[PDB]
A paper describes a structure:
For insulin, we also compared the electron diffraction results with X-ray diffraction results obtained from micrometre-sized crystals obtained from the same preparation.
The structure of bovine insulin was determined by both X-ray and electron diffraction using crystals from the same batch, i.e. grown under the exact same conditions. The asymmetric unit contains two insulin molecules as well as two zinc ions and two chloride ions located on the crystallographic threefold axis and 23 water molecules. This zinc ion (and its symmetry mates) lies on the crystallographic threefold axis and is coordinated by His10 NE2 (Zn–His10 NE2 distance of 2.05 Å). The insulin structure refined against electron diffraction data at 3.25 Å resolution agrees well with the X-ray structure refined at 2.3 Å resolution in this study (r.m.s.d. of 0.38 Å on Cα atoms).
Numbering used by the authors:
A (entry chain B), D (entry chain B), H (entry chain B): 1 to 29
B (entry chain D), F (entry chain D), I (entry chain D): 3 to 30
C (entry chain C), E (entry chain A), G (entry chain C), J (entry chain C), K (entry chain A), L (entry chain A): 1 to 21
The structure:
Amino acid sequence: FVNQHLCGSHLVEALYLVCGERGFFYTPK
Amino acid sequence: NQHLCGSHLVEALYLVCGERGFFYTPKA
Amino acid sequence: GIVEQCCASVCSLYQLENYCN
Amino acid sequence: FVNQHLCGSHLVEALYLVCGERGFFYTPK
Amino acid sequence: GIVEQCCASVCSLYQLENYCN
Amino acid sequence: NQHLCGSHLVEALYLVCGERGFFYTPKA
Amino acid sequence: GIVEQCCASVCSLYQLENYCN
Amino acid sequence: FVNQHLCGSHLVEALYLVCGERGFFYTPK
Amino acid sequence: NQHLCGSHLVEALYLVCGERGFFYTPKA
Amino acid sequence: GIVEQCCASVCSLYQLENYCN
Amino acid sequence: GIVEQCCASVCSLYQLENYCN
Amino acid sequence: GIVEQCCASVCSLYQLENYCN
Ligand SMILES: [Cl-]
Ligand SMILES: [Cl-]
Ligand SMILES: [Zn+2]
Ligand SMILES: [Zn+2]
C-alpha cells in the first residue's frame, strides 16, 4: 500500500474500501 | 427515491452530513 | 439498519440525515 | 443538509442524488 | 449561476433542486 | 461496450459532454 | 431513452454524445 | 468529445470508460 | 471482503497501487 | 483474472496489490 | 486528526483502519 | 506523458485511448 492524498468524498470512499462490512465512523475535526 | 448501496451509500452520507460527520454500520 | 432502509429498500436524503453525527 | 463545495463530476453526482428518477439538466455558464 | 456558486463558493442541495425535471 | 447505469451514467455524460452541459432524463 | 440504450442495453461514448447540450 | 482535466482517481475512471472490457495500463511518470 | 466490479474495481486499484501504476485486464 | 477473483468472487486489498506495476 | 492528515498531507490505509468498527 | 498532461493541463479521450489493451 502507498501513502494517499484523500480529501472529502475521496476519503470516505477509501474508508469504505478499507473497512468494508465492518463499517466505519467519519469524524472530521 | 433511489436504491443507495455500498460506496454510493457512503457518498450520499458525505453529501447530506458533510463536516457533521456520519456513521456507516451495515451490521446495525 | 441503513442498508435495509436505503439499499435493499429505498430512502430519501432526509432519511439519510438520521446517520449524521 | 449542509452547504457543499462541489466541482465537476462531484457536482453532477450531487444532482443525480438530489434529482433521482426526476432527471436533471447540467448547464455550466 | 448556482452551478458556478457550488464550485467557486458553496451551494445547498435545495439550490441544486432547481435543476431537476 | 459497457452497461452505464445511474451515477455511472451521469459521470460518463460529464466526461463526454463537459462544459457543453447535458441532460439526464430517465422518463424520456 | 438513455437508460434503455446505455444502462439496460449498452452504448458507446459516441451514443452518449447525443445527450450533450 | 471535449478536452478534460483529470487528476488521480478521476483519470482512472476516464480510462475505465474509454477502454472498457479491452482493459488498460495506468502508468504515471 | 467485498465484491469490487468495474469502475469500483479500478478505483480500488488506484487506491492500493497509487503512483506505482497498475494494470486492469478483464480478458486475463 | 482480477474480475473473477475480486468482482465475481471477493478479494482483499492485499490480493489487489498483485495487479500493481 | 488522521482525517485532516489525509487531506492536508498524506495518510496510510493502516491509519484509516483506525476508523473501522 | 499524456497521464501528466491530463492533470497539469488537459487531454482528450483519444489520447487516453493510447492506454487501452
Ligand atoms: Cl477532486
Ligand atoms: Cl454500482
Ligand atoms: Zn474528486
Ligand atoms: Zn457503482
